[PDB]
């Protein structure tokens, strides 16, 4: 019943954990505690098998541990800066080659999977710093330039006409812009990792750069030059919606160094590069 299901949604009780049943003393030639990890399987022994348990009714739910929940939180993926210093025409617009690899927090979470398919929700948080005192009337334009479309080279480039590309205009004072984007890949899922090249020569590129081109985000202050200089910083937040993930993998153990690559750097004292805290010895808790 969709209504019962609805109640479960509201209470967050869609996925319930099993109860613990009462167990008793045993004397058997069936030893559940003994097994063989060589098989590559985890011994499914439960508490009732190794001790005498009481009956307990579980009320815990796994809803929050769902992939939708894990990746369904909006996090920052880019900080765009437009700092008017001495040349408005050159400093009033910029561009970014879109990717979800520049911020460690969300990158690490997505990378716990090999392939992921999801729709995106983008929320932008623009903040205008009044460097000289007033901010005037700031109107921003964020244009999505898919790979192939002409990238504007000046603040008045014809490409800004956005005759076909999707543009979002924001007026200072109005609520934060937000829009959704359908799964964009040309494949069935996004590659979080890609053990391949775009060719078979010594100079072929390796990794997700080959498969994950999302195009360019071009921004510009629509307002013409003003007396007082401003510094507009637009923070882009991304959230995954309607998510699916395949083949889980180990979490990133060392810091990230670059986008589209698993490369890392190690110091002379590697224990400083990982989160493992050295133990005094085996018996010191």
């Amino acid at each position: 019943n969709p209504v019962e299901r609805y109640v479960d949604e509201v209470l967050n009780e869609v996925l319930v954990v099993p109860n613990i049943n009462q167990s008793h003393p045993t004397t058997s030639n069936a030893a559940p505690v003994l097994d063989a990890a060589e098989t590559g399987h985890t011994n499914k022994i439960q508490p009732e098998d190794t001790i005498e348990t009481r009956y307990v009714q579980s009320s815990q739910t796994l809803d929050e541990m769902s992939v939708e929940s894990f990746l369904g939180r909006s996090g920052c993926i880019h900080e765009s800066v437009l700092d008017i210093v001495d040349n408005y025409n050159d400093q009033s617009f910029t561009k970014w080659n879109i990717n979800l690899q520049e911020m460690a927090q969300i990158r690490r979470k997505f990378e716990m999977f090999t392939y992921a398919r999801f729709d995106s929700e983008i929320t932008m948080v623009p903040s205008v710093a009044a460097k000289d005192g007033h901010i005037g009337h700031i109107v921003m334009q964020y244009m999505y330039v898919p790979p192939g479309a002409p990238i504007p080279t000046t603040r008045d480039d014809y490409a800004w006409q956005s005759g076909t590309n999707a543009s979002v205009f924001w007026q200072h004072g109005q609520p934060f812009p937000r829009f959704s984007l359908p799964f964009l890949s040309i494949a069935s899922a996004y590659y979080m990792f890609y053990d391949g090249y775009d060719g078979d020569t010594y100079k072929s590129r390796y990794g997700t750069v080959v498969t994950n081109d999302m195009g360019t985000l071009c921004s510009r202050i629509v307002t013409s030059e003003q007396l007082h200089k401003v510094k507009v910083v637009t923070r882009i937040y991304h959230k995954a919606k309607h998510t699916k993930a395949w083949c889980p993998r180990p979490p990133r153990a060392v810091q990230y160094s670059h986008t589209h690559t698993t490369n890392y750097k190690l110091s002379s004292e590697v224990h400083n590069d990982v989160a493992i805290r050295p133990r005094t010895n085996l018996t010191t808790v």
Binding site: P147, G148, A149, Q161, T164, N165, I186, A187, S188, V210
Partner: protein, 178 residues
């Protein structure tokens, strides 16, 4: 040839060496010289493409001129064929010129991914189309020793474009006034 109708024709003539190459181009829908064809122009208003392409060729020689040509499509993952033998191993059509002037070669959708980028992208380059002499251009005496050929392109039933974008095949460098 640009700025002349001749940029649309390929000239054929009696060969002295066998299996010579006639022409070679990329199959990528928005690459040159496909870019300015109607399908290339429309594909440039989109980011993704998929489907099979139909290439047709019409012979313009005299009614008494004969010729057999091999048209081949080479799927990616290899360089363009260096010889007829190399090209012949891929998808191909042997065209015999006769009463019916036109022939069609279909470039099947053979890709890893369901779609490819319309813009030149290494990962999604679709391969090549090469044309070679199967036999030779033969004519009777007193007949022009060269002839032209016209090339067409259109999409098959499975052709499809996706994700609208602005075209890079046209620009505006100044105001358009009255």
């Amino acid at each position: 040839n640009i700025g002349n109708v001749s940029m649309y024709t390929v000239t054929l003539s009696p060969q002295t060496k066998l299996a010579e190459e006639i022409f070679a181009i990329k199959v990528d829908i928005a690459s040159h010289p496909l870019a300015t064809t109607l399908i290339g122009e429309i594909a440039s208003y989109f980011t993704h493409w998929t489907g099979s392409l139909r290439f047709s060729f019409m012979f313009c020689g005299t009614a008494n001129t004969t010729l057999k040509v091999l048209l081949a499509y080479t799927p990616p993952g290899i360089g363009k064929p260096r010889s007829r033998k190399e090209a012949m191993l891929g998808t191909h059509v042997v065209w015999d010129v006769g009463l019916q002037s036109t022939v069609s070669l279909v470039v099947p959708w053979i890709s890893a991914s369901q779609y490819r980028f319309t813009t030149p992208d290494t990962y999604s380059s679709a391969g090549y189309i090469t044309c070679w002499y199967q036999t030779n251009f033969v004519v009777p005496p007193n007949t022009p020793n060269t002839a032209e050929m016209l090339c067409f392109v259109s999409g098959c039933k499975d052709f499809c474009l996706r994700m609208a974008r602005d075209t890079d095949l046209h620009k505006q460098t100044g105001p358009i006034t009255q």
